[PDB]
Amino acid sequence: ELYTKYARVWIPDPEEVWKSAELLKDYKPDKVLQLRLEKDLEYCLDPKELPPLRNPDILVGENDLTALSYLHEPAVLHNLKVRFIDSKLIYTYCGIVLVAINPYEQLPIYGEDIINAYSGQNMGDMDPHIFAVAEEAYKQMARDERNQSIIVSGESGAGKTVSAKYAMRYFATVSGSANVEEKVLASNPIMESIGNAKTTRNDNSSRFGKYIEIGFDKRYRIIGANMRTYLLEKSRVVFQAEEERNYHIFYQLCASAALPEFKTLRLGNANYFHYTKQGGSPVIDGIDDAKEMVNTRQACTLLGISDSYQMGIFRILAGILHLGNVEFASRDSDSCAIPPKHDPLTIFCDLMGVDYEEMAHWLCHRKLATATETYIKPISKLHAINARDALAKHIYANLFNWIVDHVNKALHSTVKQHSFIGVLDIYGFETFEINSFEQFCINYANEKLQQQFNMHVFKLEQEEYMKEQIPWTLIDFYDNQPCINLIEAKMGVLDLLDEECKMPKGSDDTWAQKLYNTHLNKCALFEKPRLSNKAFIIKHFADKVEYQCEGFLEKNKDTVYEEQIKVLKSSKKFKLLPELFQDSKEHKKTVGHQFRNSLHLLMETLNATTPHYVRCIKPNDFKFPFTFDEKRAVQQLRACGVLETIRISAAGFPSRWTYQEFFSRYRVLMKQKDVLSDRKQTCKNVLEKLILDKDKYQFGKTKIFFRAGQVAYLEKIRADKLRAACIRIQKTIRGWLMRKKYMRMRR
Amino acid sequence: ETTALVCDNGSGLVKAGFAGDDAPRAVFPSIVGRPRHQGVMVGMGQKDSYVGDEAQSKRGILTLKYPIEHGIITNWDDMEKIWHHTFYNELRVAPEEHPTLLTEAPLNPKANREKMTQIMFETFNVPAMYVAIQAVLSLYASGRTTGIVLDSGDGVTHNVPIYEGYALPHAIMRLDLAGRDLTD
Numbered sequence: 001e002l003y004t005k006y007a008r009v010w011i012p013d014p015e016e017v018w019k020s021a022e023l024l025k026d027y028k029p030d031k032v033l034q035l036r037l038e039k040d041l042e043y044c045l046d047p048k049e050l051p052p053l054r055n056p057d058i059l060v061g062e063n064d065l066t067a068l069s070y071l072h073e074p075a076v077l078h079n080l081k082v083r084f085i086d087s088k089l090i091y092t093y094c095g096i097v098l099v100a101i102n103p104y105e106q107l108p109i110y111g112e113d114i115i116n117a118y119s120g121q122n123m124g125d126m127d128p129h130i131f132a133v134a135e136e137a138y139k140q141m142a143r144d145e146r147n148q149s150i151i152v153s154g155e156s157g158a159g160k161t162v163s164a165k166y167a168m169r170y171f172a173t174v175s176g177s178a179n180v181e182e183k184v185l186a187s188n189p190i191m192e193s194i195g196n197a198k199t200t201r202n203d204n205s206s207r208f209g210k211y212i213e214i215g216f217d218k219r220y221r222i223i224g225a226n227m228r229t230y231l232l233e234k235s236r237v238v239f240q241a242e243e244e245r246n247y248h249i250f251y252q253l254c255a256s257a258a259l260p261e262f263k264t265l266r267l268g269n270a271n272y273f274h275y276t277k278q279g280g281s282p283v284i285d286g287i288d289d290a291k292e293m294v295n296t297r298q299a300c301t302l303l304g305i306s307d308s309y310q311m312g313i314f315r316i317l318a319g320i321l322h323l324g325n326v327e328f329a330s331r332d333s334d335s336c337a338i339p340p341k342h343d344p345l346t347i348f349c350d351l352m353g354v355d356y357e358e359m360a361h362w363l364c365h366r367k368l369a370t371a372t373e374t375y376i377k378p379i380s381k382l383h384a385i386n387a388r389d390a391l392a393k394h395i396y397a398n399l400f401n402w403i404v405d406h407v408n409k410a411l412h413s414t415v416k417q418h419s420f421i422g423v424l425d426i427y428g429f430e431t432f433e434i435n436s437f438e439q440f441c442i443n444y445a446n447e448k449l450q451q452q453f454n455m456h457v458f459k460l461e462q463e464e465y466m467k468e469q470i471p472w473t474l475i476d477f478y479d480n481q482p483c484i485n486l487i488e489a490k491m492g493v494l495d496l497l498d499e500e501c502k503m504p505k506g507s508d509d510t511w512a513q514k515l516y517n518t519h520l521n522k523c524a525l526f527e528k529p530r531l532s533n534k535a536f537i538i539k540h541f542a543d544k545v546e547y548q549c550e551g552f553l554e555k556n557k558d559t560v561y562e563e564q565i566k567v568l569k570s571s572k573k574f575k576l577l578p579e580l581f582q583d584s585k586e587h588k589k590t591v592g593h594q595f596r597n598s599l600h601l602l603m604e605t606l607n608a609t610t611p612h613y614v615r616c617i618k619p620n621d622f623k624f625p626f627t628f629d630e631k632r633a634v635q636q637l638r639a640c641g642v643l644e645t646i647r648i649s650a651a652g653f654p655s656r657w658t659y660q661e662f663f664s665r666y667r668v669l670m671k672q673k674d675v676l677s678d679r680k681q682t683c684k685n686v687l688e689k690l691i692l693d694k695d696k697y698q699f700g701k702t703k704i705f706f707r708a709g710q711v712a713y714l715e716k717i718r719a720d721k722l723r724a725a726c727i728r729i730q731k732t733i734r735g736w737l738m739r740k741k742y743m744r745m746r747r
Numbered sequence: 748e749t750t751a752l753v754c755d756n757g758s759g760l761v762k763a764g765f766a767g768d769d770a771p772r773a774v775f776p777s778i779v780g781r782p783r784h785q786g787v788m789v790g791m792g793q794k795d796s797y798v799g800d801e802a803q804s805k806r807g808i809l810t811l812k813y814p815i816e817h818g819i820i821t822n823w824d825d826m827e828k829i830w831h832h833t834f835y836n837e838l839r840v841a842p843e844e845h846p847t848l849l850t851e852a853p854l855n856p857k858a859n860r861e862k863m864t865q866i867m868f869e870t871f872n873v874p875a876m877y878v879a880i881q882a883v884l885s886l887y888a889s890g891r892t893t894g895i896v897l898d899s900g901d902g903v904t905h906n907v908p909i910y911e912g913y914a915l916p917h918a919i920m921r922l923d924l925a926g927r928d929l930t931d
């Protein structure tokens with residue numbers, strides 16, 4: 001079998017996810033392996049698994065992880081670890097995907113000489129680099145007018161922004177120049193301020209998907225850029241878990257409060273306001289939010305938001321903060337009122353230019369109109385609080401869309417866009433010790449993107465199989481559609497959640513009970529956690545994730561009362577507040593439904609386009625330059641779906657050889673009888689002797705296709721033959737030389 | 748996409764609309780008038796019968812009939828006229844495209860439900876429908892899973908106790924007092 005003496009295997013280890021071991025006695029079918037480690041060990045072979053075999057060293061370090069014959073977690077982690085630590089290469093293909101590892105260090109590779117070296121070169125020609133993706137997108141756009149996308153995924157801090165920056169720098173250099181890249185880089189401070197938040201694992205996490213469209217003219221000169229956004233995490237504006245913050249802008253604003261300009265806002269310290277206070281952790285270590293405010297305002301100026309509009313924005317945000325302090329006294333089970341002369345509401349009305357008496361009335365009552373007849377009726381303290389928080393979320397989302405539209409006004413250019421290349425910065429799959437509605441939406445968006453990826457890769461495989469005239473049937477599609485239908489179908493988790501929001505006396509216990517009713521035993525992907533009746537498990541593409549129900553109903557509710565909008569629309573103190581709304585069923589939509597719609601807009605934008613994928617990984621938490629941590633990276637390779645992409649490629653024909661290079665490699669196996677001057681027929685004759693099963697390889701037109709094991713098996717038998725020949729020859733040489741010394745001994 | 752129609756036949760007012768909007772956009776009395784005087788002027792566009800607000804506007808010259816008395820539909824052709832008027836004129840929606848949800852008082856004859864369903868499937872060709880108890884819907888409307896609902900329209904009054912979503916059908920009381928006989 002493959003497990004012979006002097007084989008090598010990966011064995012699991014607590015402190016680095018896998019470690020190498022040499023098989024010290026060959027294995028036979030049973031329960032024992034004698035292993036030797038770089039010392040001496042015995043390892044129980046136990047159900048069943050044999051330990052993962054190790055690739056022959058010729059394969060280790062190659063530019064494409066799918067060139068490996070054994071494809072599995074430790075071989076991938078080893079090839080990335082050696083290339084990064086030893087070579088200090090940071091880019092590696094996986095199939096179509098480019099894997100990019102954050103070095104936390106500057107590098108020379110982005111010089112314009114290398115930009116020129118990549119230009120016009122196909123991916124085969126040159127070692128992988130982000131420019132090799134940009135150039136591919138550029139030439140795909142040139143061949144066929146179809147727009148192109150570049151898609152960048154990973155945990156925040158993996159370097160997605162710098163990857164996009166160099167990607168567009170490539171376009172700027174190859175097209176020549178129109179000063180887009182400066183404006184786009186100058187926009188990042190405000191989008192990071194309004195759109196990023198501290199999270200339990202990570203500072204400056206981005207809670208939205210940002211899509212930059214670089215537009216080209218008929219010459220493929222850079223015209224200008226357009227910016228869209230999707231999947232904003234609205235629910236964070238009003239609620240945070242422990243050790244989380246609100247969006248940075250709120251804390252930059254609060255810390256500024258001592259400044260002369262912001263005096264009129266009557267801002268307090270960041271733990272005074274209810275929306276900032278909840279998270280527990282007002283201060284990020286190593287950031288001065290008061291200083292960050294200056295960079296934010298500077299970038300507003302550079303993008304030409306007038307200081308009138310800037311003071312409008314900070315007015316609106318202080319409005320949201322003061323609004324969050326408004327506190328309702330329940331005068332009945334079905335009625336509430338705002339205590340008289342309420343200072344939070346007095347300051348909110350002063351800031352926003354509205355009649356105190358109208359906000360005080362409409363916050364506590366809601367209005368219904370039959371076509372002839374209208375009734376004003378009170379609402380409980382719970383509905384009043386839910387409606388105040390839905391108003392704060394609706395104001396924030398409209399301010400965000402407004403700042404994005406005023407950035408777009410600065411980035412657009414008047415030339416008609418012939419076609420565009422677009423770059424999508426999006427968060428990757430996410431798992432924490434506690435998982436919640438935010439993580440549920442993020443993992444559903446990632447299930448959608450991973451489906452569209454798998455189906456693009458399947459299309460490209462069917463094309464390559466046509467190109468080599470191999471039957472299509474050999475490749476099977478791997479479809480995560482059952483998990484999408486689990487999450488988003490009617491009677492899905494989101495559907496039952498939107499039902500339980502309107503249901504009377506809905507609660508997280510009865511929602512969970514409806515979940516267990518519908519899907520506890522009907523779906524393999526939904527499971528109940530053994531010890532709890534308040535949580536549920538979904539088997540996602542990457543991993544099983546356990547979600548707690550306990551938050552979702554509060555986070556899912558949006559309903560905004562028209563009268564409360566019309567109060568703000570009536571404001572005349574300042575012009576931004578009526579401008580935000582200027583724009584009915586949407587006011588009834590839950591956060592989950594707005595999310596599913598923004599995700600369908602995103603999938604429409606992407607399906608129109610031809611994607612190219614980049615995955616970013618963050619090799620260590622502490623930002624040490626060129627250090628690597630196996631237990632961090634295995635987590636991020638799992639979350640980026642690189643490991644499942646490799647698993648899906650390991651079934652099929654992952655290893656592909658040109659007949660020329662195959663023959664060059666394995667002449668040693670061929671007997672001089674059977675070497676023809678046609679290489680291809682020699683190879684077809686020989687491989688059927690060397691490998692018994694025709695299933696294990698396919699003869700393409702120009703390339704030989706192997707299943708995973710076979711190329712390493714041929715390398716093993718080659719090396720063992722060459723060992724036998726070497727030993728036999730060298731014993732002959734040594735024998736002659738001792739015979740010569742014997743001839744001396746006679747002489 | 749497709750949104751159910753919701754219709755409550757009552758006595759007196761019809762009120763109807765689309766599911767998931769908050770108040771009915773058709774409301775009108777369930778009344779049918781037929782003219783009783785000799786028509787004199789030739790060429791007037793004079794009409795065989797009037798429904799709803801038409802029969803309120805012209806009521807000086809009409810005999811007004813209620814097709815529903817004490818929640819029982821006594822006259823079926825006029826009830827078909829009232830539904831035809833509701834779907835085509837008031838909502839301007841073709842009923843083949845929408846499930847319909849219909850409301851009834853408890854403890855009234857079964858023939859009323861059999862005929863309501865035979866009519867909605869055979870003449871209107873409504874793809875799907877349901878018949879709901881009037882009192883049960885007032886709990887959905889008031890945000891509760893528990894309570895004794897007291898309901899009075901025109902015609903029938905009834906009490907229905909409900910506790911955590913279970914009805915108690917032996918305790919349902921029904922009374923014919925309400926609303927029209929106050930006017931008489």
Ligand SMILES: Nc1ncnc2c1ncn2[C@@H]1O[C@H](COP(=O)(O)OP(=O)(O)NP(=O)(O)O)[C@@H](O)[C@H]1O
Pocket residue numbers: 101102103104105106107155156157158159160161162163204205206
């Ligand atoms: N290819 C690279 N070369 C050099 N430094 C890099 C590279 N990629 C990332 N970095 C460093 O990684 C850090 C963060 O990178 P950046 O692109 O700014 O990510 P980011 O701002 O955190 N966006 P996000 O990951 O969504 O939070 C900086 O110190 C960068 O210098």
Ligand SMILES: Nc1ncnc2c1ncn2[C@@H]1O[C@H](COP(=O)(O)OP(=O)(O)O)[C@@H](O)[C@H]1O
Pocket residue numbers: 756757758759760761899900901902926927
């Ligand atoms: N404001 C009111 N005060 C007293 N009686 C009313 C009022 N409005 C309607 N009614 C009476 O109640 C009855 C209508 O109630 P309604 O709920 O529309 O009946 P149904 O439930 O059969 O549709 C009529 O008899 C009408 O005269």
Ligand SMILES: [Mg+2]
Pocket residue numbers: none
């Ligand atoms: Mg950064």
Ligand SMILES: [Mg+2]
Pocket residue numbers: 156157160161204205206
């Ligand atoms: Mg970022």
Ligand SMILES: [Mg+2]
Pocket residue numbers: 755757758881899900
């Ligand atoms: Mg009624």
